[PDB]
Symmetry: C4
Subunit: 274 residues, 4 copies
């Protein structure tokens, strides 16, 4: 068997974190990324697992995740470095049969631990599993520059923020018809911010943390990365437009309605009504 | 002989899509690219073709393209990934003898299909073939960031937009003397927007889709990429200038006239008249 | 024994300088970087040392640095070229037993000398050694674009500047709770600016040189680079926000206090009091 | 003997053009670069020369360049492509004994010719040879984005423009104490614009072409690239500052005078007097 570092999921984690680094979204240890796998993905690589996997409790019981393996970024690790030493910067964890904690099956070497935003990640996976009938498998957080800047100048309201982001690139309503949930500012690395994010994830695939960054959910690494890249691209356009004095013209409600009809998506009602 | 992946046209498609990705013009699956080939280009590579080429109808009859091969980007495919798996992200199609449809001779694996903007592409090829006596061979669409931003702040008028872009870098009048056609906002992925784009291509090598992006035409991948890159560079300069309060001075009509005379190009009259 | 160019410390210097070059922080010979080593790091590579190591006096006696080796960037050398020829662009120097000067043991070929900001570097090492009980080992200077821009539009005051940078990305208060010291503009390459920077390093891990750039200190190359990248990322966000007409909402004092208490850090009092 | 493509000068031309491409300064065929060589540089590589070197006249006699070889970028060639095929995109030319014309000894394949800005280049080399006692060997033109943007908003005046660029990064007065000469807009690719540039090069190492770009001169590729990168970095800072409402504070005349004193340079009097 090829080494686990050559697997699609390890290579995918390297590509996504490295790409995010090059985008300027992941200074220092900013950002974190978790991908839900199946047993069948990791089973063939069992020979590469730790001889005595470390056990760490979860922040709270998560029985929906019982027996579920994930590949995750490590706490304090730099996205820039993942490509240089995957086992030091990433790991595979498997939640136990009670959903009480997990074993570190591979990686997170040298006493590394999973991201300190694990509550936000795993609680959000739970809500997205329920919301998408098990389709979504990735939660990604990064410090997307223009989205962050917009949280200082736009009303921090789901409808307003969704509507502006839809306007800032035509594809946006098709890529995120459910819109972008916006939380109040909250203290990072807490179960509060984690659960608040998970609750927003019931209704949206994107959640903004004002003055901080973004969370996205999707079925694959590429589709989740691309979801965030789309919102951030729209944000980039908007920052330019606002810097030039604002919109002289823009995508109208009628045009958004026609767009939704053509692509068979139902646009978030509150954002459309503006 | 050598694999078709090493051919000039597959390598060229990889270079253009990868470069556009690095420019930040092609988030997610944004953008599409088609290059018209000759039979002689692809004939040596017949052993790399699909054993049983799939047939797909065109959106409408295109008899001018009868028997014509193209290399195209696939629908939903990411420009970022083309370099990683050319056959998964690109395909070679050959239009049948009636211009009714095409066979997928190579690539577009796992049941992929050509870009959903194929009407805009192939109808534009038809009009550019007629306009340039068969010299043009490429249609490129991307989400050129600054060009998109300008569509929210400048009058969406061909004369006005052309004139500002000529002003934003001296070379522009020489690179696109016919100017930049601007459509109204339209629903993507329709034959209406495809047909409207092709009409504009009768008179211009560049066409803007407000709040969305750009289409360019040219004889080679590099010339078409360079055409868009030139307009987008000018847009980048303009966004900076407008953000700094606007033009204190600029390229004058007299200077544009002298420039056109020196390089033997006839500047779009409506843009010059402003 | 492998060549010293393959050592962890030469490779680390290459990574940091190359990464900073890619960030746009190190045009021409802008920036300088020094890393304090142990004798045991360089001892195995003694065969690579110059046959007759050149002696250069220090600008002033630095007895705390007696017998201490450093790897340093050379004066006038381009960060862009470090990866191409480490020995031409970097050097290993060892301070003599009375802290009066150093020998150039390796590199700085063709009569190159250490950075002309050596006083700023070595005097800051001395103060950081005292301040951190020997934990800090790196001093990094670069021309961080957005931090530079902010020095023309924000009050050049430690409290004000620190508070804005904390506001521009949530993590900042946790990454630099001691804040950012701001000096007046001073003539580069002098012991005055070096000594002034070192004094500020008694109280902060980041120091700004108005209309010029930044200095950072940390235990490792990555930690120091990451410190600067965090401050510069916040600056980038702030430049966008200010360009869009300023902060409509932002991180509050209350929130900053809550953040400090969650992460067990004491925020700089003066910046918190604003 | 190795292929001439592996020579220091071909490799140098690849590095400079590729780096300028990555900076966003050389869309399409924007920019041009010429490096003066010695006979001894190219003599070893005669087997790589063309069977029958093409002769092309110079635009006017340049006796100072009699018998002088250069490596040059080709007309209409893309900086982006120089790394992919040096011979297609670059050429080695040797000026004849009269200074009346040159032979294309290597490269510029498929009937390519030297840059259409050859008058600006070769006339500028002549003036810089005289101005520097033969030290300068490189003339570089590129479309430096922020410098271009500033020409729409700052007075296009040597003193004013020099003074702002000095203010926008502390090092600038030391890197270009003679300042930046600003021409009026002129028609590209003419001996008029070429000689006007060469005359400005008598007094300055940087010359600006409003609404177009920059020319720089220096002893080596790196020093000339670095000169331009420094001015463009300052321009980048200024564009941010001006976009944020302008300078609240800046480098003073007193400070510029002190800087010039320290580094033994004589600042351009007109720029200092402002
Ligand atoms: Zn975060
Ligand atoms: Zn599109
Ligand atoms: Zn400096
Ligand atoms: Zn030019």
């Amino acid at each position: 068997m090829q080494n686990i570092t050559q697997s699609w999921f390890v290579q995918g984690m390297i590509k996504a974190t490295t790409d995010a680094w090059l985008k300027g979204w992941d200074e220092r240890n900013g950002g974190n990324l978790t991908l839900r796998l199946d047993d069948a993905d990791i089973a063939p690589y069992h020979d590469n697992f730790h001889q005595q996997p470390r056990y760490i409790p979860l922040s709270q019981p998560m029985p929906l995740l019982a027996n579920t393996p994930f590949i995750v970024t490590g706490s304090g690790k730099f996205f820039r470095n993942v490509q240089l030493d995957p086992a030091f910067n990433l790991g595979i964890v498997k939640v136990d049969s009670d959903g009480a904690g997990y074993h570190i099956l591979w990686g997170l070497t040298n006493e590394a631990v999973p991201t300190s935003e694990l509550p936000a990640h795993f609680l959000s996976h739970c809500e997205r599993i329920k919301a998408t009938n098990g389709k979504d498998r990735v939660i990604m957080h990064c410090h997307a520059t223009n989205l962050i800047a917009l949280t200082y100048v736009l009303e921090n309201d789901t409808a307003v923020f969704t509507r502006q982001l839809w306007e800032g690139s035509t594809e946006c309503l098709v890529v995120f018809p459910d819109g972008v949930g916006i939380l109040p500012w909250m203290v990072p690395g807490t179960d509060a911010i984690g659960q608040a994010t998970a609750q927003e994830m019931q209704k949206h695939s994107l959640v903004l943390w004002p003055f901080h960054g973004v969370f996205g959910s999707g079925p694959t690494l590429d589709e989740t990365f691309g979801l965030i890249d789309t919102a951030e691209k729209s944000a980039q356009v908007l920052v330019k437009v606002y810097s030039m004095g604002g919109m002289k013209q823009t995508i109208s409600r009628e045009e958004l309605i026609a767009l939704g009809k053509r692509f068979g998506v139902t646009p978030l009602a509150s954002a459309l009504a503006l």
